[PDB]
From a paper:
In this study, we report on the identification of a distinct class of sirtuins (SirTMs) found primarily in pathogenic microorganisms and show that these function as protein ADP-ribosyl transferases. Members of this sirtuin class are genetically linked to a specific subclass of macrodomain proteins, which reverse the sirtuin catalyzed ADP-ribosylation. Moreover, we show that in Staphylococcus aureus and Streptococcus pyogenes the sirtuin-mediated ADP-ribosylation is dependent on another posttranslational modification—lipoylation.
To better understand the spatial relationship between ADP-ribosylation and lipoylation attachment sites, we determined the crystal structure of SpyGcvH-L. The structure contains residues 1–110 and is comprised of a barrel-sandwich hybrid formed by two β sheets flanked by short α helices. In comparison with previously solved H-proteins (RMSDs for all Cα atoms ranging from 0.575–1.14 Å), the most striking differences observed in SpyGcvH-L are (1) the position of the β4/β5 loop (residues 38–40), which diverges from the consensus path by ∼6 Å as a consequence of the presence of Arg72 in the β8 strand (a position usually occupied by Val or Ile); and (2) the absence of a C-terminal α helix. Intriguingly, the missing α helix, which is held in place by electrostatic contacts between four conserved residues in the canonical GcvHs, would occlude residues implicated in ADP-ribose attachment in SpyGcvH-L (Glu24 and Asp27). The absence of the steric hindrance imposed by this α helix may be a prerequisite for the GcvH-L/SirTM interaction and thus could account for the high substrate specificity of SirTMs. Mutagenesis showed that the lipoyl-attachment site is Lys56 within the conserved Ex(2)Kx(10)G motif (Fujiwara et al., 1991; Spalding and Prigge, 2009). Only extended exposure revealed slight ADP-ribosylation of E24A, whereas no ADPr incorporation could be detected for D27A. These findings suggest that Asp27 is the likely ADPr attachment side, but further indicates involvement of Glu24 in the ADP-ribosylation mechanism. On the other hand, Glu24 is only present in GcvH-L homologs. Since ADP-ribosylation is a known modification influencing protein function and interactions (Barkauskaite et al., 2013), it is interesting to speculate that the MARylation state of GcvH-L might regulate the availability of the lipoyl moiety for redox reactions. This idea is supported by our finding that the ADPr attachment site is in close structural proximity to the lipoylation site. Strikingly, SirTMs show absolute selectivity for the lipoylated GcvH-L. Altogether, these data show that lipoylated, full-length GcvH-L is required as substrate in the ADP-ribosylation reaction.
Residue numbers in the entry: 1 to 112
The structure:
């Protein structure tokens, strides 16, 4: 199941929630040239996940969900090109567990 929040894609697969870039966010910030993750494994809503420098702005990716970080796309720090891609294996940011079902359900559906 796919949701959108904070211009991020959130996909539920079993107990794991993958948070990725969207084309809308890419278009709004421009080309990413730098990407640095925070080291907090227990996120609250609005906690910083990832700091970006891009051609139109710098910004922070803020978590739309409380949860526990199980995977970060640390490849993007070496190769920020990945986060400008359309490919799901390249443009993901983090995977969370220990997410509240109702809080995910309350997000807007991806597409509309």
């Amino acid at each position: 199941m796919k949701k959108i929040a904070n211009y991020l894609l959130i996909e539920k697969t079993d107990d794991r929630y993958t948070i990725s870039m969207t084309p809308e966010l890419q278009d709004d910030i421009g080309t990413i040239g730098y990407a640095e993750f925070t080291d907090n494994d227990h996120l609250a809503v609005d906690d910083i996940i990832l700091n970006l420098e891009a051609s139109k702005t710098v910004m922070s990716v803020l978590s739309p969900l409380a949860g526990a970080v199980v995977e970060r796309n640390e490849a993007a720090t070496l190769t920020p090109t990945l986060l400008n891609s359309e490919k799901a294996e390249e443009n993901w940011i983090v995977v969370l567990t220990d997410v509240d079902q109702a809080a995910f359900d309350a997000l807007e559906d991806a597409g509309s």
